[PDB]
Design an enzyme around this catalytic site. Structure first.
Site, PDB file in Angstrom:
ATOM      1  CB  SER A  61      -0.717   0.001   1.362  1.00 32.94           C
ATOM      2  OG  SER A  61      -2.035  -0.794   0.973  1.00 32.94           O
ATOM      3  CD  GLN A 117      -9.913  -8.278   1.091  1.00 32.91           C
ATOM      4  OE1 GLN A 117      -8.876  -8.582   1.337  1.00 32.91           O
ATOM      5  NE2 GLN A 117     -10.947  -7.900   2.201  1.00 32.91           N
ATOM      6  CE1 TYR A 147      -5.192   0.182   3.286  1.00 35.47           C
ATOM      7  CE2 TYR A 147      -4.940   2.595   3.597  1.00 35.47           C
ATOM      8  CZ  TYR A 147      -4.575   1.512   3.161  1.00 35.47           C
ATOM      9  OH  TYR A 147      -3.190   1.093   2.465  1.00 35.47           O
ATOM     10  CG  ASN A 149      -6.415  -2.234  -1.632  1.00 34.05           C
ATOM     11  OD1 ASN A 149      -5.759  -1.533  -1.217  1.00 34.05           O
ATOM     12  ND2 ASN A 149      -5.916  -3.705  -1.355  1.00 34.05           N
ATOM     13  CB  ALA A 315       1.614  -5.279   4.394  1.00 35.91           C
ATOM     14  CG  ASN A 340       2.251  -7.914   6.566  1.00 39.58           C
ATOM     15  OD1 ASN A 340       2.730  -6.855   6.973  1.00 39.58           O
ATOM     16  ND2 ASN A 340       1.303  -8.636   6.128  1.00 39.58           N
TER      17      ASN A 340
HETATM   18  O1  1MU Z   1      -2.557 -11.010  -5.016  1.00 36.83           O
HETATM   19  C1  1MU Z   1      -3.117 -10.021  -4.743  1.00 36.83           C
HETATM   20  O2  1MU Z   1      -3.886  -9.449  -5.716  1.00 36.83           O
HETATM   21  C2  1MU Z   1      -3.035  -9.306  -3.338  1.00 36.83           C
HETATM   22  C3  1MU Z   1      -1.677  -9.003  -2.803  1.00 36.83           C
HETATM   23  C4  1MU Z   1      -1.338  -8.432  -1.654  1.00 36.83           C
HETATM   24  C5  1MU Z   1      -2.538  -7.863  -1.138  1.00 36.83           C
HETATM   25  C6  1MU Z   1      -2.209  -7.323  -0.008  1.00 36.83           C
HETATM   26  C7  1MU Z   1      -1.577  -5.784  -0.234  1.00 36.83           C
HETATM   27  N1  1MU Z   1      -1.697  -4.923   0.791  1.00 36.83           N
HETATM   28  S1  1MU Z   1      -3.054  -4.060   0.634  1.00 36.83           S
HETATM   29  O3  1MU Z   1      -2.984  -2.885   0.021  1.00 36.83           O
HETATM   30  O4  1MU Z   1      -3.978  -4.865   0.190  1.00 36.83           O
HETATM   31  C8  1MU Z   1      -3.521  -3.706   2.342  1.00 36.83           C
HETATM   32  C9  1MU Z   1      -4.751  -4.126   2.880  1.00 36.83           C
HETATM   33  C10 1MU Z   1      -4.770  -3.638   3.895  1.00 36.83           C
HETATM   34  S2  1MU Z   1      -3.384  -2.997   4.911  1.00 36.83           S
HETATM   35  C11 1MU Z   1      -2.637  -3.017   3.251  1.00 36.83           C
HETATM   36  C12 1MU Z   1      -1.177  -2.865   3.141  1.00 36.83           C
HETATM   37  O5  1MU Z   1      -0.712  -2.795   2.274  1.00 36.83           O
HETATM   38  O6  1MU Z   1      -0.905  -2.391   4.101  1.00 36.83           O
HETATM   39  C13 1MU Z   1      -3.875  -8.034  -1.633  1.00 36.83           C
HETATM   40  C14 1MU Z   1      -4.156  -8.749  -2.593  1.00 36.83           C
END
Ligand code: 1MU
Length: 358
Positions: A61, A117, A147, A149, A315, A340
């Site tokens: 993020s 998500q 929050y 995506n 993360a 993470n």
């Molecule tokens: O395989 C995928 O498409 C995928 C990869 C990572 C993730 C987690 C990425 N982090 S995030 O943007 O979705 C997020 C969500 C809650 S906190 C957080 C962060 O990045 O800190 C989600 C989906």
């Protein structure tokens, strides 16, 4: 490497890596505008490849800071306005829950409960349209922050529409190239794989999986050198020669909504400096799975305040990243790790370092 930075960095990060069992880490401190780099451990445990200043980490993020700045640059170009309705850029979004939802709401997670998500099931452009058409807000627009995506992701995609460019090409040409971020990628090219660290999740090597709106929400990978340079650019936008990019960075640090002690920018989040460390420390918790919080609108948004703690956690399944800086003090930090680990441990280490240098 002045001994004082050397000492606070090693004194803070060494125990961090031990307690959190982080396989590999890179840190940059920006002090009086100059970067100082540190690395530890392994980019790839199996292959015994060390973390170096050229290692790519998934930013997760933290990518949202690039999306907010790219959006800022599109506004400054006169391509979009945050006050525009979402439908202005996606007229196929005809479901009436969208009336009144603006690009501002998408950029700042205040559309009315868009989910964290985008569902895995959603792949094609027609899947994405079905998803948004079917989505039922829990709240009126501009009342609560959740929050998401699916919120800022959509903002990034719509924001580049008038440009004519794909999101990736817009990001390369308008943000990465002008800032000389020449080892920052939405898609890692084959020539660069030798530098791409593995993430570690439960001790398995992993990389982020493709998904809808991935590039826009969590898909950037970068090196500690580029990320130091990203922090420098955000510390001092007036040094940037591309007029719309300067303005765009400034817009991403404007204060649009307040919840508690936090202000929502575009991608960045901000608190007044000096900050209560427990307030930023406890305030980072992606262990609250969903915290919906009421927002107060800042009418009109406050321009970028120099005495702010500006930051972003990020993360992926295998990576943990954190960026924080204080414009007035010309001071910042980037921490990139291939595990993470919990957000409060990142903000505590970052605060302990910058507090000691401030
Ligand atoms: O395989 C995928 O498409 C995928 C990869 C990572 C993730 C987690 C990425 N982090 S995030 O943007 O979705 C997020 C969500 C809650 S906190 C957080 C962060 O990045 O800190 C989600 C989906």
């Amino acid at each position: 490497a002045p001994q004082q930075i050397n000492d606070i960095v090693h004194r803070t990060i060494t125990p961090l890596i031990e307690q959190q069992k982080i396989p590999g880490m890179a840190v940059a401190v920006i002090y009086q505008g100059k970067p100082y780099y540190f690395t530890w451990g392994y980019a790839d445990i199996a292959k015994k490849q060390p973390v170096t200043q050229q290692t790519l980490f998934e930013l997760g993020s933290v990518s949202k800071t690039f999306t907010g700045v790219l959006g800022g640059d599109a506004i400054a170009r006169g391509e979009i306005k945050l006050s525009d309705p979402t439908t202005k850029y996606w007229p196929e979004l005809t479901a009436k829950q969208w009336n009144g939802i603006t690009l501002l709401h998408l950029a700042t997670y205040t559309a009315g409960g868009l989910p964290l998500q985008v569902p895995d099931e959603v792949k094609s452009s027609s899947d994405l349209l079905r998803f948004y058409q079917n989505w039922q807000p829990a709240w009126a627009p501009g009342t609560q922050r959740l929050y998401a995506n699916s919120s800022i992701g959509l903002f990034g995609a719509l924001a580049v529409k008038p440009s004519g460019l794909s999101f990736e090409q817009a990001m390369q040409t308008r943000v990465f190239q002008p800032l000389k971020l020449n080892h920052t990628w939405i898609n890692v090219p084959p020539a660069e794989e030798k530098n791409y660290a593995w993430g570690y999740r439960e001790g398995k090597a992993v990389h982020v999986s493709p998904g809808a709106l991935d590039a826009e929400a969590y898909g950037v990978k970068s090196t500690i050198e580029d990320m130091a340079r990203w922090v420098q650019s955000n510390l001092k936008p007036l040094d940037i020669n591309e007029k719309t990019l300067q303005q765009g960075i400034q817009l991403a640090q404007s204060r649009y909504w307040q919840t508690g002690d936090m202000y929502q920018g575009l991608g960045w989040e901000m608190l007044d400096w000096p900050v209560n460390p427990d307030s930023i420390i406890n305030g980072s918790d992606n262990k609250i799975a969903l915290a919906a919080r009421p927002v107060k609108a800042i009418t009109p948004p406050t321009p970028a305040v120099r005495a702010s703690w500006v930051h972003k956690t990020g993360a992926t399944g295998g990576f943990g990243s954190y960026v924080a800086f204080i414009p007035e003090k010309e001071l910042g930090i980037v921490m990139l790790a291939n595990k993470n680990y919990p957000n409060p441990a990142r903000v505590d280490a970052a605060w302990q370092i910058l507090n000691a240098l401030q």
